[PDB]
Amino acid sequence: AEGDDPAKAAFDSLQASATEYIGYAWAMVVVIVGATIGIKLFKKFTSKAS
């Protein structure tokens, strides 16, 4: 029950990492995930869960 596609979630994914305009993860994906997963795994617990 969603006017914006039944799976807007994949829309952002399948479109993100695709090929044409590759949504916009082809690069920015590793850029931010670098910062998110960066300060994340790092300040998450001194490593993974310590």
What is the 3 state secondary structure string of the chain?
Answer: CCCCCCCHHHHHHHHHCCCCCCCCCCCHHHHHHHHHHHHHHHHCCCCCCC
Residue range(s) defining the domain that contains residue 41: 1-50
Contact call for residues 2 and 10 (beta carbons, < 8 A): no
CATH number assigned to the domain comprising residue 36 = 1.20.5.80
Spell out the residues 6+ positions from residue 43 whose beta carbon is closer than 8 angstroms to its own: none
CB 34 within 8 A of CB 28: no
HSE (CB half, 13 Å, CA atoms) of 6?
A: 0
Count of Cβ atoms closer than 10 Å to residue 16 Cβ: 16
Count of domains in the chain?
1
As a whole number of angstroms, the distance between CA 44 and CA 50 comes to: 8
